Symmetry: D2
């Protein structure tokens, strides 16, 4: 009966807004967090006070072994997830010639390897339950490239390509696979010089809110969105 | 403080499903038709059956002066639309070497010139109400990727995409989102589609519904595909 | 065997550069013009003076019947074209609310209807000659992402791209490739300078392109080794998009 | 006077590119990892037809080997004018069955490639102040796979890296583009793949390596200096 949705990074910002909204939609939210147990608990309590249901889960997304262990156990105990939302991390400009090995490797392995680390333990349980499903990845913002971000652009484009290929793979199981690509989102601590930097590039001349990303994820998660797959959809105020 | 949404081609198929879903969403639907009054009436009947509301309107999207006259009179009587859904459009499939003048022109006119004919009388009244707004055009996977026998249709729908993105840039400062919905193959009465089925009219309407919703206010200048994974 | 290539709008700028370069490549160029006869003869004289061959043709790409008559007569007399470069176009820039009927219609029916008006008389002869061929349409970055004050131009060029892809699919088995070239901002001379450096910061290369730089990509697509490139829209825009 | 590194030039597309770019007049650095026979023949063919070049060996998966060999080669001969970074061969694996090693290995070979080969080359190029050309090579467009999430992730990542680097080096008159071939007849193509793919290809034939090399030749050419940040597909209409 009940449909469970794992939301990574649901202790803060975009992941928290997604978790709250999907709980409102009726999904049993698995609120994931890395270190911030207080924030995850806050998310879950917000969910419960607005009439929904969920539970916490903890793992470090860059720790593949830990991801597998915690997810396989949570799944063995509670059943396969109907949905998996894989949220993104932050970026830091660095010009390619100046870029160090660690900057390249770290960006690639935190932003691209998390696709495998989080989704591999989750996909076949979802297939085996044969009730369809939903997978939604999120970009750091992937389609266009950006100065000083060859590593983050490679990672984000990689996620997009992995997402689309997996969409082709899982189409026959009635699991939709889509990527959401937000523009500049106001998550509460963004640099002023960042706002200053990009606001003229944004037709709507304003930052997006986390709830605005969550609305798009809520749509993709909904039953009527079952013919939408293999897509990367941007919520960026017209930036691109 | 009712919010009115014009839906062209709403007497049948995708247009009908959009009109019905948006009425369920709480919008007052202006059900447009050209000759299919019976279909339009059935749409409005269903709208009221679900507890919604709306009204009919008649014009030929290809007749620019008729469009302007009827739309401006409707806006005079009831106020400006909050949303416009530009859905009407025909196909005249054929090999390009065999394609006639009529087969080219009719497709361009009904599919692409309707952008100007329907939206031009509607934009400034929308802007002047200073309450934001929504414009959703309809294209096709054909417009994104090309398709044999559809040089005309692919041209017209790709053109709708380009016009839509431009208008998005123009109207963003009034908080009016402008987006385009590109359905794949829709069953309105197959091994190249990953989901291995045709789409349903309601599945197009669901995406139009999302775009018409208040929480979609930061999505603009987009062409979003509901196509089973074709592209 | 001589291969004829029609080049619309070849009296000036990009069309001229394409005509001159293709003549250098060895193609017999049909230099088309609408009103600018002297520019077209300038193009043909350049071609001739570097040892190439060509001939003029006149018609208005807006006038479908004139296009058909002139192209059918030229092809009846000289045989089917091997290549067609659909280059000619117009802009009528305006914000959408202020845009007139004629500013919308003129752009759609000159830039987008051109596809049918020029290519329909030319495709079946090309196919019938069973030698393969080349069709290259010219669009714009405006038709890829949209631009303020260009709902009409963006629509027409996006439409050109969609038609190009569909025709590519129809003709692929005929060994005719069909592609679209999308230039960025090209220095055609006398280009308005406010427009110019308003556009400079969007262009990574921090310069406008040269007509020869567009002609070089058309020249590549026209070449035999490009026979596996079709259904593509290729941008020459200094990294704009 | 203008040197071009061509990785994977011992065979197939890489060989075709090396041969053609040498006919265009570039001095080709013919790279190989294990296929020394093939690279020797690539260089010998170049020289027989009146061109010039030299061999270089390294494993593109070994960042250290790449850096040492490329820095040494550049120190002796000066920075490359062009770098062509070719792609490996694809493999089917359903995502559920895919192993840690299949994922990590494809990312490491097909994506980290970008850093391992290009990073030693970019700043020297910039410092020579003669402009330059970088071309990455993505096999794309096919339908009906049993899964290629890792290869498609790496190829999409290469495209993103390429476009971003294009943005960085635009000011330096260095163009950076990606070429995405369809199904190319390298002589080692599975019969099953030919059968399944051909009805999806409007041209109804595989491409020839020389048809990819012609597009690389165009991008390397001086007249192509206004083409940058692009992915250009040579695929017979596949997509």
């Amino acid at each position: 009966m009940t449909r469970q949705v794992l939301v990574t990074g649901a202790s803060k910002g975009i992941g928290k807004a997604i978790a709250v909204q999907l709980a409102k939609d009726g999904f049993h939210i698995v609120v994931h967090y890395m270190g911030d147990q207080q924030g995850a608990q806050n998310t879950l309590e917000t969910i419960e006070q607005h009439g929904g249901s969920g539970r916490l889960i903890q793992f470090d997304i860059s720790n593949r072994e830990e991801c597998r262990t915690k997810l396989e156990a949570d799944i063995a105990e509670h059943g396969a997830y109907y949905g998996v939302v894989n949220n993104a991390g932050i970026t830091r400009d660095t010009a390619f010639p100046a870029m160090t090995e660690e900057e390249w490797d770290g960006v690639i392995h935190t932003n691209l390897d998390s696709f495998y680390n989080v989704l591999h333990p989750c996909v076949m349980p979802m297939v085996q339950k044969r009730k369809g499903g939903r997978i939604v990845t999120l970009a750091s913002v992937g389609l266009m490239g950006n100065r000083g971000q060859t590593n983050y652009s490679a990672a984000k484009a990689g996620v997009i390509g992995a997402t689309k290929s997996l969409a082709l793979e899982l189409a026959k199981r009635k699991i939709t696979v889509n990527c959401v690509a937000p523009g500049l989102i106001d998550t509460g601590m963004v640099d002023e010089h960042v706002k200053e930097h990009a606001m003229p590039q944004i037709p709507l001349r304003r930052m997006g809110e986390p709830e605005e990303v969550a609305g798009l994820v809520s749509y993709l998660m909904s039953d009527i969105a079952g013919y939408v797959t293999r897509q990367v959809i941007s919520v960026n105020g017209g930036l691109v």
